[PDB]
Symmetry: none
Subunit: 90 residues, 5 copies
Amino acid sequence: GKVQIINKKLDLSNVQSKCGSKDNIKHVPGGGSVQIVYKPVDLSKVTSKCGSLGNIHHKPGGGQVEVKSEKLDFKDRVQSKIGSLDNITH
Amino acid sequence: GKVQIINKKLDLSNVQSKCGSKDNIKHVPGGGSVQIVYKPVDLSKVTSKCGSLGNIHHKPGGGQVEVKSEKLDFKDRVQSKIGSLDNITH
Amino acid sequence: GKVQIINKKLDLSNVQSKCGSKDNIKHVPGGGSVQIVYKPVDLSKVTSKCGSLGNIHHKPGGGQVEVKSEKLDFKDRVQSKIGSLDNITH
Amino acid sequence: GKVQIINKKLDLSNVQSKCGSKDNIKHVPGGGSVQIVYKPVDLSKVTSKCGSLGNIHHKPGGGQVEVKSEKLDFKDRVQSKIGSLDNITH
Amino acid sequence: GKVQIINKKLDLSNVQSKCGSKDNIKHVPGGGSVQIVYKPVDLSKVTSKCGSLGNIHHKPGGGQVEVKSEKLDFKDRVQSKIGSLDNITH
């Protein structure tokens, strides 16, 4: 007889989204009208290791039947609108 | 028989959204109308190790029936409106 | 027989959203109307180890029936409105 | 028989979207009406190790039936409108 | 028999979209109406290791039936409109 199944996994990984940002609005000496709309919609999403992982089945036997159905269904919708922006000097 | 199964998993891993950020608004000496709408919607989502993981089934049957349905549904809907902004100087 | 199953899992992981942030509003000496609308909606969500994990089943049966349905449903809806902002100087 | 299966996997991997960004608006001393609409919709999505991974099956059966369906559906919809912006000087 | 299967994989990899960026609006001293609509839609998507990977099956059967369906559908739809912008001087 004898059967021998060995799985060795080392995961060191680095998964990132928007990790390091610098954002500035500086120095406005003007004396006229200044209008700024700075990033209306700023999203980030991260999915990792979602589904079916690392499972073990030990199932010896002659006449067995099996029916699996896996579905993953990811749906985003982002909707935006910028209207009347009025900026007037003298 | 003498069946042997080994699963050695070592995990060192970094998963991140928006981890480091420096943000500034500075130095307004103008005397002129200043309007700023800063990042209106800012959403960060992280999902990890969802659904089925690290499960052991030891199940020896000669005539065994197994049915499994596994469905993952992930929906995000975002809606932003910036309809009327008025800026006036003098 | 002597069937043997071993599953050694070690987890060290950093999972994070918006973990370090420096945020500042400074130095307004103008004498002219200043309006600032900072982030009206700011959301951070983290999910980990959801559904089924680390579960052990020992179930030897010659003629056994098993049915399983597993649904994880994650729905998020965000709605933001910035209808009227007015800034006036002199 | 004496069947042997070995799976040694080592992963060091960096996955990133928009990791470092320096963004600035600076030095407006003009005295003339200034309007700026900065990046209105800004989305970053990262997905890794989704669906089925690292699963071990030991299943010796003389006359066995196995049926599987696996469906991955990822639909993203983005809709942006910037209808009326007015900048007027003197 | 003495079947031996060995699968050693070492992964060192960088996968990135928009990793480093310096972006600036600077020095507006004109005194004449200035209008700027910066990148209206800006999207980054990274997907890795989706579907089936790293799965071990030991399944010796004399008369065995196996049926498998695997479908990956990735649909993205993007729509941008910029209808009426007015800049007036004197």
